């Protein structure tokens, strides 16, 4: 019933303190914007490095940047677009494996 | 088959194998053994409750509908918003 | 909605005249057993069961409240035929229906407790089978499941109530000729008249 | 999984955390009774449930005068021939023909699928 | 009697019982009312059945059942139950002989008769839920004997199969070469007849 | 039924300053008679009469015993 | 033995069925077909069928040949007893 969706939400409200705002900057292209939702820099430079010791490892850090940036642009929150750059650098790491550069 | 799939409902029980209720508050010691390196991973770079919800998906029904992950993923924070966690394995 | 959800199934039970559904502990309960380790003895056989414990754990999520045998016969009580005005009466009609109504084969009489328990666990067991798919639902047109009344049978349940209401006219006879002192008689009560 | 009980009043131990030490405690309604538990598993639900009823099966059906038996079969662990069978006898299954056997000689009862 | 027969043959009774020697016991039924359990069915019911076939303690028409898979023993007293009588089979062979035939064919200045031969053990009353834990022959000497194994353990053969047709329907000749809505129609039309 | 249920239906029934009290003990049945003498089921069926037999009953008063035979 | 794979859109129990069903209306038909092209010129039943007066064909696969199976409400006749139709089945026979 559409019940559930209040009793949900009055739990959660139940689950208050203030979000934390964005802070600007790193290497990272447009990493100064705030408009990805829960993105911080350091989240970012995170992903990024990430992407750039997987592209070292098959092997620069332009790649790595295009593939955190990429990602960024097309996931729905920033929680969600560090999930899919490990996913990337997963499929990187099946690459190496299978010898492939 | 595509239409097929588009034009049929399905819900998670359709696709899901086995799910547990377990009480884990510690993210790095995690008392099932299985996920133990990408529940690091995924913590290593960021409060929360300390009970967990495990799901299992049977592999037969989720290959046979063509589905992903991460289309169950989106689908998750698309029904529930931001207010859960979510963490997932891959194929 | 989310507590039915969670929920899922509950047993209850239909005790004849009361005027509605009674849930399973309550009853067991109200016959006088109040840990839900003796409950579970009484129902479940063997405990190495987790699928029928689980089963049976909604339940027993009802007697959070009732722990006692008073308490429960009040709460069996309070939906008669007739709802009393008083607590006392409610509670020795609870009483009277579960001693007179309920199972009336298992026995009668005022020890007959210790084995109602055990046929009322009988009959939750096998609803709890039969919901684990772990035996076959029963069909009313199989015919080990009837009787026949023939003119025995027929003959006297129809024989029962008129010497009932014999019975009926001549105390209501001897009431009469009575309430005056002077004598009475026994030709004189009986209706064969009824009888034929 | 299972319930247990506590010693002092003999009802259910309802889970209650413990916001102190980070630890899973099970206590009941009636009295003060405290536990800790081994399982660390409040809740499990399996929706396959595709029980094997080698554990159901009792060994007792080995004397059913209505079932069929075959001497094909001999048992794995006592080497008896004849050997009863018949299949899952189990309502909610949503599709199986599988046989199951029983072994006939006494005391043996072994009770295994091929 | 079977009560007390019961109470004789090592039945423990349920205010008697701890709850926790009940799993591995079948739990004994009389009249639908459970009355104890036991630990030794296959003896228990061998003896009930041995009784009630010597028509000693147990008489001719109680029923006595089995399931084996859910462990009970369910015995009826009851009146109502309709019921049928088959023959016994002992190993592979008819307990009915051809003493029993000629006994019979010389009924007449003899007083043998059909409640001599249930006496005898040789004949049964089946009901219809008693039928259910019985594997049935249609003709001895065409089932009993060895074959292409279908069956080897039959518990019970038919007097005769075509004992299954009412009073109207006994007197249609060939009646299974007929179509069976022929047969009700006739069954219908028999009492109709002028005589 | 004859045999059995009525005697049972009979005794089954709960039994009814002085006082008075009543218990009924046993029952009997004759052969089927006419009032107006045995009745034969042709003559029955002729006359347009009930083929039927009298029941009688064993009945003791007491007052705070007397007892009353085939009532 | 398991081997039997089951035909989309159906259960295991749908596919045996059908198979089973299958092959049995196959032999009640090749029946009727021989009893039928074995008849004669001089036949009553075919005379009374051929020029339509009254029968059928199977009326006269039927009589000649083959019954055929017995069918309750759509489905083969069913488990009235203990998972078996009559007292002088072994239990779970499904043969024809
Ligand atoms: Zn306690
Ligand atoms: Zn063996």
């Given amino acids: 019933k ?21 802070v600007p900057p790193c290497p990272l292209k447009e990493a100064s914007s705030r408009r990805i939702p829960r993105l911080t820099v350091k989240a970012r430079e995170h992903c990024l490095r990430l992407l750039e010791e997987a592209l070292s490892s098959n092997r620069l850090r332009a790649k790595a940047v295009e593939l955190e940036h990429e990602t960024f642009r097309n996931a729905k929150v920033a929680n969600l677009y560090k999930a899919s750059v490990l996913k990337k650098v997963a499929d990187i790491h099946r690459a190496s494996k299978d010898g492939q550069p | 088959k595509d239409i097929l799939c588009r034009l049929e409902h399905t819900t998670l029980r359709k696709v899901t194998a086995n799910t547990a209720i377990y009480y884990d508050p510690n993210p790095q010691s995690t008392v099932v053994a299985e996920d133990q390196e990408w529940v690091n991973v995924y913590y290593e770079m960021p409060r929360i409750s300390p009970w967990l919800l495990r799901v299992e998906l049977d592999r037969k029904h989720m290959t046979d509908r063509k589905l992903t992950m991460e289309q169950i993923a989106e689908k998750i924070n698309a029904g529930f918003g931001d207010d859960l966690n979510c963490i997932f394995n891959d194929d | 909605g989310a507590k039915k959800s969670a929920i899922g199934q509950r047993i209850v039970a239909t005790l004849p005249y009361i005027k509605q559904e009674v849930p399973i502990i309550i009853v067991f309960r109200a016959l006088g057993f109040v840990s839900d380790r003796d409950i579970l003895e009484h129902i479940i056989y063997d405990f190495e069961d987790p699928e029928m414990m689980e089963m049976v754990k909604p339940s027993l999520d009802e007697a959070f409240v009732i722990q006692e045998q008073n308490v429960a ?124 | 999984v299972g319930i247990r009980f506590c010693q002092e009043c003999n009802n259910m131990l309802y889970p209650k955390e413990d916001k102190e ?94 | 009697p079977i009560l007390e027969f019961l109470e004789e043959w090592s039945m423990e009774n349920l205010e008697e019982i701890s709850p926790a020697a009940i799993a591995d016991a079948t739990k004994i039924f009389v009249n639908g009312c459970w009355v104890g359990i036991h630990k030794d069915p296959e003896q228990l019911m061998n003896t009930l059945r041995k009784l009630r076939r010597q028509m000693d303690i147990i008489v001719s028409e109680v029923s006595m059942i089995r399931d084996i ?73 065409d089932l009993q004997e060895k074959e292409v194994a279908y069956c080897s353990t039959y518990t019970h053969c038919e007097i005769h199969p075509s004992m299954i047709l009412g009073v109207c329907a006994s007197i249609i000749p060939f009646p299974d070469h007929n179509q069976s809505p022929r047969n009700t129609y006739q069954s219908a039309m028999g009492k109709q007849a002028m005589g | 039924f004859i045999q059995m249920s009525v005697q049972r239906i009979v005794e089954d029934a709960p039994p009814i300053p002085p006082r008075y009290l009543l218990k009924f003990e046993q029952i009997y049945l004759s052969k089927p008679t006419h009032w107006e003498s045995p009745m034969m089921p042709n003559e029955a069926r002729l006359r347009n009469l009930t083929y039927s037999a009298p029941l009688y009953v064993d009945i003791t008063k007491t007052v705070i015993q007397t007892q009353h035979q085939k009532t | 033995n398991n081997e039997l794979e089951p035909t989309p859109g159906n259960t295991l129990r749908q596919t045996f069925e059908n198979q089973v069903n299958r092959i049995l209306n196959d032999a009640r038909d090749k029946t009727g077909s021989s009893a039928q092209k074995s008849l004669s010129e001089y036949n009553n039943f075919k005379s009374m069928v051929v020029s339509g007066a009254k029968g059928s064909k199977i009326n006269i696969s039927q009589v000649i040949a083959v019954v055929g199976q017995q069918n309750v409400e759509g489905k083969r006749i069913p488990f009235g007893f203990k998972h078996r139709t009559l007292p002088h089945f072994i239990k779970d026979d499904y043969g024809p």
């Avoid at chain 1, 019940?3 to 934390?20: A, G, H, S, T, V």
């Avoid at chain 3, 035929?81 to 008083?86: L, R």
């Avoid at chain 5, 007449?108 to 219809?128: K, M, R």
């Fill in chain 1, 2 to 22: 559409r019940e559930w969706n209040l009793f949900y939400q009055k739990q959660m409200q139940l689950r208050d303190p203030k979000i934390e705002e964005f």
């Fill in chain 3, 73 to 196: 016969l009040n709460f069996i009580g309070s939906r008669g035929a007739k709802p009393g005005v008083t607590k006392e009466k409610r509670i020795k009609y609870a009483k009277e229906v579960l001693q007179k109504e309920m199972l009336p084969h298992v026995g009668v009489s005022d020890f007959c407790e210790t084995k109602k328990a055990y046929f009322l666990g009988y009959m939750v067991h096998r609803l709890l089978l039969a919901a684990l798919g772990r035996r076959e639902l029963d069909d009313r047109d199989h015919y080990g499941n009837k009787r026949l009344d023939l003119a025995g049978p027929l003959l006297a349940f129809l024989f029962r109530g008129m010497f009932k209401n014999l019975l009926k006219e001549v105390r209501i006879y001897a009431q009469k000729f009575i309430d005056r002192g002077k004598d009475f008689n026994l030709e004189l009560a009986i209706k064969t008249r009824i009888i034929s």
């Fill in chain 4, 21 to 114: 030490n980070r630890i899973l405690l099970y206590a009941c309604r009636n009295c003060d009774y405290q536990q800790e538990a081994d399982n660390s598993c409040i809740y499990v639900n399996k929706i396959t449930h595709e029980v094997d009823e080698l554990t159901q099966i009792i060994a007792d059906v080995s004397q059913d005068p209505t079932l069929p038996r075959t001497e094909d079969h001999p048992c794995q662990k006592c080497g008896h021939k004849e050997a009863v069978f018949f299949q899952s006898h189990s309502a909610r299954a949503e599709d199986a023909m599988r046989l199951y056997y029983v072994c006939t000689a006494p005391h043996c009862g072994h009770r295994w699928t091929e």
């Fill in chain 5, 69 to 141: 898979r859910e462990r009970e023993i369910r015995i009826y007293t009851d009146a109502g139950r309709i019921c049928r009588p088959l023959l016994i089979v002992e190993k592979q062979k008819l307990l009915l002989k051809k003493r029993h035939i000629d006994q019979l064919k010389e009924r007449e200045y003899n007083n043998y008769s059909w409640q001599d031969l249930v006496a005898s053990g040789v004949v049964e009353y089946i009901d219809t839920l008693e039928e259910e834990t019985v594997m049935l022959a249609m003709t001895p000497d």
